[PDB]
Amino acid sequence: MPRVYKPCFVCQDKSSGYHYGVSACEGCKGFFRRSIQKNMIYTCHRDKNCVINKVTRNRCQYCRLQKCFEVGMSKESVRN
Numbered sequence: 001m002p003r004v005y006k007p008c009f010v011c012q013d014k015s016s017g018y019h020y021g022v023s024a025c026e027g028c029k030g031f032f033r034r035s036i037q038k039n040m041i042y043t044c045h046r047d048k049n050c051v052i053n054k055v056t057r058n059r060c061q062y063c064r065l066q067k068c069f070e071v072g073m074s075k076e077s078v079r080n
């Protein structure tokens with residue numbers, strides 16, 4: 001599937017209740033702090049073409065931390 005509703009804002013349908021800057025998947029805001037806040041040092045592991053619209057996934061940290069970050073969600077420079 002191409003795109004209908006985000007609210008991940010990227011990975012690409014799952015939502016809820018708007019925290020920081022984006023529309024997030026709740027899974028995403030969880031992911032966002034999970035990597036950023038406590039458990040990231042990363043270039044991307046899978047590869048940085050690790051794909052999320054909804055054909056996809058192919059999901060990892062840096063890749064779509066940074067694509068979810070295109071809609072600069074704040075788990076930001078967290079908490080660093």
Ligand SMILES: [Zn+2]
Nearest residue numbers: 008011025028
């Ligand atoms: Zn998501």
Ligand SMILES: [Zn+2]
Nearest residue numbers: 046050060063
């Ligand atoms: Zn990846």
